[PDB]
Enzyme design. Structure first.
Site, PDB file in Angstrom:
ATOM      1  N   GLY B  46       7.410  21.250   9.568  1.00 15.44           N
ATOM      2  CA  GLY B  46       6.328  20.587  10.318  1.00 15.44           C
ATOM      3  C   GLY B  46       5.082  21.267   9.857  1.00 15.44           C
ATOM      4  N   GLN B  51      -3.490  23.952  11.164  1.00 14.37           N
ATOM      5  CA  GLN B  51      -2.996  24.983  10.271  1.00 14.37           C
ATOM      6  C   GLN B  51      -3.625  24.979   8.869  1.00 14.37           C
ATOM      7  OE1 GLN B  51       1.258  23.891  11.289  1.00 14.37           O
ATOM      8  NE2 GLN B  51       1.360  26.076  10.755  1.00 14.37           N
ATOM      9  N   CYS B  94       7.196  29.718  12.046  1.00 12.05           N
ATOM     10  CA  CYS B  94       5.901  28.983  11.878  1.00 12.05           C
ATOM     11  C   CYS B  94       5.295  29.475  10.603  1.00 12.05           C
ATOM     12  CB  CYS B  94       4.979  29.250  13.059  1.00 12.05           C
ATOM     13  SG  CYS B  94       3.366  28.301  13.052  1.00 12.05           S
ATOM     14  N   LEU B  95       4.801  28.552   9.792  1.00 16.69           N
ATOM     15  CA  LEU B  95       4.133  28.933   8.529  1.00 16.69           C
ATOM     16  C   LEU B  95       2.880  29.745   8.755  1.00 16.69           C
ATOM     17  CD1 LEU B  95       4.519  25.538   6.661  1.00 16.69           C
ATOM     18  CD2 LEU B  95       5.790  27.713   6.296  1.00 16.69           C
ATOM     19  N   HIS B 136       6.677  21.669  18.976  1.00 13.52           N
ATOM     20  CA  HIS B 136       6.061  22.856  18.330  1.00 13.52           C
ATOM     21  C   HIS B 136       4.765  22.460  17.611  1.00 13.52           C
ATOM     22  CE1 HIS B 136       6.249  26.601  15.700  1.00 13.52           C
ATOM     23  NE2 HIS B 136       5.482  25.798  14.972  1.00 13.52           N
ATOM     24  N   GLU B 137       4.804  21.360  16.830  1.00 12.99           N
ATOM     25  CA  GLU B 137       3.539  20.969  16.156  1.00 12.99           C
ATOM     26  C   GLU B 137       2.474  20.542  17.158  1.00 12.99           C
ATOM     27  OE1 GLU B 137       4.961  22.594  13.120  1.00 12.99           O
ATOM     28  OE2 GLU B 137       2.960  21.838  13.081  1.00 12.99           O
ATOM     29  N   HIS B 140       0.145  23.203  18.356  1.00 15.47           N
ATOM     30  CA  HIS B 140      -1.041  23.561  17.500  1.00 15.47           C
ATOM     31  C   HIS B 140      -2.284  22.715  17.837  1.00 15.47           C
ATOM     32  CE1 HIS B 140       0.936  26.238  14.718  1.00 15.47           C
ATOM     33  NE2 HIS B 140       1.835  25.349  14.334  1.00 15.47           N
TER      34      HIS B 140
HETATM   35  C1  LIG Z   1       7.780  23.631  12.923  1.00 13.35           C
HETATM   36  N1  LIG Z   1       8.447  24.799  13.454  1.00 13.35           N
HETATM   37  S1  LIG Z   1       9.788  24.694  14.402  1.00 13.35           S
HETATM   38  O1  LIG Z   1       9.948  25.874  15.239  1.00 13.35           O
HETATM   39  O2  LIG Z   1       9.820  23.632  15.380  1.00 13.35           O
HETATM   40  C2  LIG Z   1      11.161  24.438  13.414  1.00 13.35           C
HETATM   41  C3  LIG Z   1      11.635  25.775  12.868  1.00 13.35           C
HETATM   42  C4  LIG Z   1      12.826  26.342  13.387  1.00 13.35           C
HETATM   43  C5  LIG Z   1      13.265  27.577  12.909  1.00 13.35           C
HETATM   44  C6  LIG Z   1      12.497  28.216  11.927  1.00 13.35           C
HETATM   45 CL1  LIG Z   1      12.981  29.858  11.347  1.00 13.35          CL
HETATM   46  C7  LIG Z   1      11.320  27.637  11.394  1.00 13.35           C
HETATM   47  C8  LIG Z   1      10.873  26.412  11.866  1.00 13.35           C
END
Ligand SMILES: CNS(=O)(=O)Cc1ccc(Cl)cc1
Ligand SMILES: CNS(=O)(=O)Cc1ccc(Cl)cc1
Ligand code: NA
Ligand code: NA
Ligand code: NA
Ligand code: NA
Lengths: 166, 166
Positions: B46, B51, B94-95, B136-137, B140
């Protein structure tokens, strides 16, 4: 000898550490020497034994070189007592959580007690950054790291990026 | 074009983003294309516009390749509604917070609504990982990151080190 510092996510940081029972020993003085070496190579201001995967109530801390100087100290079996209810916010980071920091409320004024590595008693009143460092290291001996103490998540971020003015 | 992803600590991640008002435009389709490129180069699942320091209610997400496939989707002006009170814990990273992850409770079942970049409406029911990614997105776009949602701080740590079995 420099020891590896384990990072957050290692279960060994989440343990409640037992007391030191070899005060005055050559083995303790060697462990303490490694801790000071390790802390200095990582440029830390505090290091607790669980951070080098040693399960003991032991920390080292202190420096000349910003806050006011904190005496170089090795402290076993630390016990802390606030001397006032007053809390103060300040920046904290941690060698086991490289690259990050956050604002954390700590007691402004504490006393702490324990023993130097030669077995002699240590007891001191401390305030401000000195007191903060001792509370932060003490948390490692009960399996706690600073993120579980953040109140304002706007202040949590990478050191090279944050612009929060506390 | 690949855009720089800003990291936690950047105030630009803590803003409440305004709506997208150029649906169907060449400028939006170019921004969305950069977002998909950026997300793919970072191996994300995502990516929200804040971001890449773009202050807009816009995210991209989805993949074939572990959880079940989530369709590749660009979604503007997202609105989310839980379809049950049921919460589920799962791993999130998260990036903008490279190297870390934690367990986070999300709604298991949601509907989300908004618009595709061509202006056509999108509305879908989602569950499990699909629903988690969209929540989660969406965070942000209101200036929120996952650490302020952790309940169990034992689960927060570096991806290469954690051994927590959820
Ligand atoms: C876009 N982020 S998220 O938390 O919803 C999905 C995700 C799940 C696990 C890892 Cl390690 C990374 C991303
Ligand atoms: C030993 N850790 S601490 O939080 O008490 C002192 C400290 C304060 C600020 C930074 Cl960035 C790093 C360490
Ligand atoms: Na624990
Ligand atoms: Na006391
Ligand atoms: Na905000
Ligand atoms: Na709805």
């Amino acid at each position: 000898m420099i020891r590896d510092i384990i990072r957050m996510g290692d279960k060994r940081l989440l343990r409640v550490a037992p007391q030191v029972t070899n005060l005055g020993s050559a083995e303790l003085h060697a462990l303490v020497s490694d801790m000071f070496e390790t802390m200095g190579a990582a440029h830390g201001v505090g290091l607790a034994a669980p951070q080098i995967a040693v399960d003991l109530q032991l920390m080292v801390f202190g420096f000349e070189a910003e806050a006011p100087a904190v005496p170089l100290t090795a402290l076993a079996n630390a016990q802390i007592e606030p001397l006032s209810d007053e809390m103060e916010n300040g920046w904290e980071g941690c060698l086991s959580i490289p690259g990050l920091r956050a604002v954390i409320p700590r007691y402004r004024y504490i006393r702490y007690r324990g023993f130097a590595p030669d077995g002699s008693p240590i007891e001191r009143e401390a305030e401000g950054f000195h007191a903060r460092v001792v509370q932060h290291e003490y948390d490692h001996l009960v399996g706690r790291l600073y993120p579980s103490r953040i109140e304002n998540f706007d202040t949590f971020g990478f050191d090279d990026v944050l612009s929060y003015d506390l």
